[PDB]
From a paper:
SWI/SNF chromatin remodelers reposition nucleosomes by translocating DNA around the histone octamer, and in vitro assays have shown that they move nucleosomes to the ends of linear DNA fragments before evicting the histones from the DNA. [name] has a molecular weight of ~1.1 MDa and is composed of 17 proteins, with two copies of Rsc8 and one copy of either Rsc1 or Rsc2. We found that [name] is composed of five main lobes, three that form a relatively rigid core (head, body and arm) and two that are flexibly attached (leg and tail).
The core of the complex was resolved to 3 Å, which allowed us the de novo building of this entire region. An asymmetric Rsc8 dimer defines the backbone for the complex, scaffolding the three core lobes and contacting all core proteins except Rsc3 and Rsc30. Rsc8 has four conserved domains, which are, from N to C terminus: SWIRM, ZZ, SANT, and coiled coil (CC). The SWIRM domains are in the arm, the ZZ and SANT domains in the head and the CC domains in the body. The body lobe of [name] contains a helical bundle backbone, an α-solenoid belly and a β-sandwich hook. This helical bundle interacts with the α-solenoid belly made up of the armadillo repeats of Rsc9 and the SwiB domain of Rsc6. Four proteins contribute to most of the arm lobe, which is made of the two SWIRM domains of Rsc8 held together by the Scaffold domain of Npl6 and the RPT1 and RPT2 domains of Sfh1. Six [name] subunits contribute majorly to the head lobe of [name], which is made of the ZZ and SANT domains of the two copies of Rsc8, the BrD and Scaffold II domain of Rsc58, the Scaffold I and part of Scaffold II domain of Sth1, the β-barrel domain of Rsc4 and the anchor domain of Rsc1/2.
Residue numbers in the entry:
A (entry chain E): 316 to 435
B (entry chain N): 60 to 233
C (entry chain I): 57 to 202, 222 to 254
D (entry chain L): 58 to 203
E (entry chain Q): 2 to 32, 145 to 359, 368 to 385
Amino acid sequence: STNWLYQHSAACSRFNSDLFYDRVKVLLVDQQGLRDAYTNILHIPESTQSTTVLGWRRSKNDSPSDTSIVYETVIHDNDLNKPKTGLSEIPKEIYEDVVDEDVLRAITEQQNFEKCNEYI
Amino acid sequence: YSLANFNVFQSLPKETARGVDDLTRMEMALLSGIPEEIKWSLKKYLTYSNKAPYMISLRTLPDLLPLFKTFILPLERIVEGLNKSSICDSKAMDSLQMGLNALLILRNLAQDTDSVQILVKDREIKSFILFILKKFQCVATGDNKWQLYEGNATFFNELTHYTLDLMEAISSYI
Amino acid sequence: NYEQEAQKLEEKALRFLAKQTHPVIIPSFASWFDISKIHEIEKRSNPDFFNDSSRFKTPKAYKDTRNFIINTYRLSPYEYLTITAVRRNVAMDVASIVKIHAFLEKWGLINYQIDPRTKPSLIGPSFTGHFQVVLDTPQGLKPFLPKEFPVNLTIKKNVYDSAQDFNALQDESRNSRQI
Amino acid sequence: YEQEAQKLEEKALRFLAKQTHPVIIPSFASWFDISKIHEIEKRSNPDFFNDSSRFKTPKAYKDTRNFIINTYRLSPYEYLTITAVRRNVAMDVASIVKIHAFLEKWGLINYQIDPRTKPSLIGPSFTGHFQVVLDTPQGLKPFLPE
Amino acid sequence: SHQNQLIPQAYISNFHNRLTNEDDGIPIFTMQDIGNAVLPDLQDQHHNPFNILRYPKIRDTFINGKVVSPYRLNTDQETKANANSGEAIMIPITLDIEHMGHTIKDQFLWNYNDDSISPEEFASIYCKDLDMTSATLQTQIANIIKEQLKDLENIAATEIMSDLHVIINLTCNLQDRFFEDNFQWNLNDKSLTPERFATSIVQDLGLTREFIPLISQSLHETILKIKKDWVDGHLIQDHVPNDAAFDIDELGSNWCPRVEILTK
């Protein structure tokens, strides 16, 4: 009778996997996106799309009088290895005064990392 | 050749083909806060007050005076700070010129009955006129409190004139 | 290794990128607007979402709704984007939907009706250069990695000879010897 | 008598742990103990200790937290959503969402996962890179920053 | 690049025809190369809008469309020292109306505490969108809205101060799809709103955006009903069925949401 928690947890994980597979089948595999009719417009999961715009960049042509415009989009992914969490939101008055020095440094590093990844 | 060659696109009105009526354009431009739009709209408003003041009368177009007041009160602060070299930056010069343009627009409109009737019922404009008149009196009697710095005299000159004109008009209603 | 990773990332990012077809035109006084930021003009004209009065009215909800409306309009700028469609898609109270729609319509950000075949084209001071609009990388497309890994890819490029070519969205590729 | 129930629950949780995958806890979460509270939870998540209701109690809170963490660790390569946890937990949905978001913030639930497994709404696409054109009082001018 | 080649902006509107069609299933007002793609939003047309006509839906919008004059609202003349900034009075409103040879079934929310817009203006906007302008229809709509506002007004403005946990069964049908779910809701914690709950459900199940309002709206309904039974004292608090292991607040507790397409 020591197998009940494990069975419920495994059922939860299997339910999660089923939901994920169903979403992927409906939204991305069978068709690329779902066309809504109220606005007559495609709808794709927001994850595939980008969220914000991190400023602009400008330079010059190779020769003077070369009056041309080179418009182009660019994605920027400072430290793609480390994921982002809501750690830039927890106020200092919560984690402070109960922490090890190393954990405090790690918290500060994560917060600064997210804040800097919000830049260009 | 072009998707505009559909029958549906054969019935468009002439009112929107330009995008926005110029009165709305000037109002929204003043509402924005972008300096270039502000200057463009103020030049156009000044031309209208000089050559067609019945189209922008302060009665038919309410909520027009508040914008001018927003441009005019910082002029009061500047004029108080005008007894020394204080127009070093270009943003200061731009704010001063916007204030002068709004003041001239107000005077040109006050040359009409409805507009001056709307102007009289406003404590801010009367207080500003009184402030400028007291500064002029301080210059005239030669007080040692506030002494105009001659490098700014030009500005002050124009200022005074406009104020007096305004006073003249409202002199009938006090 | 990482070369193939960045290559697949560029492939996926280009596959799920919205390709622009029609040009969008907004009046000049609506030049303070940014899709990813909120301006003082928006907070003054909509004080209810930011004064912390209610819980149903949060700045996040306002921003999500207005971004939905903006994207929906920009994707098909020839139609009108009635309020009922937005209301069927968004989950706010109808009063807030109406206020946001009216505010976006007043500043010409949506439903700005012109006939752009009656006006000339000019050149601004800022011109004649390479412009790189740098947008954040989408999640759900990042690689699966079970050392740093910066990324500064370039997805698509477009070249224009004049400003009129930029406005008409005509690239040198097809424009060269069209007929 | 109740000691025996505690023994049963401890053995059950030990079996759970003995059948869970190995995960990589991030550094900034090393303060976490599976069998403790650490007073970071007490501050971040009040109302589980104010005796507010018969339902939200620290014991049930700890049980739900451990259950969610183990359900995730059963397969760390997939985002753990709220619907499954809600299916297999008795508590107000508000508290479940609180605990889920809390455990997510500290990287204890969805730190290293296949990013394709995270759910997201389906809105229209993102028209941020599009080219806008200003309508000056004179003519159409390409909107470009300076 | 010629001036003439450009297209006018924001004049057409094919909305009503999208309502009337059966290929486009709207639950309201009823009686290179292309693969399995319907809209050009992600496929790049080679800088030639003409190719946009390869898709039948865009053609339908460009052929069966009308020219529309814009809304001209009251320019948002907000108020003078009004809007006392109460939290919200969020009451749901439904519409079942039989126009001549036409049905109208709709739902939305209404903030009773916000006096910025009036039911007559909303009726005018709705009827203009449906392209069915008639003073009788607008009067009917406004009267229905006012009735439903007056009914649930005082009940919605009753803040609960004692912890209540209720098992809730949500059931919502869009046109043919039925969404059923069961959960345990606390009527005291103002942290989670039904909108966030609906968004999470739609994200996890991967449904269309159209379910986000509906679900949330229906949820609001049930809450109000419960409030009635708690004002009349007809609401007990002694027990709540949640499958808990042996004490309360344990790990079985309920079933899960599902979406099913039915007939008959």
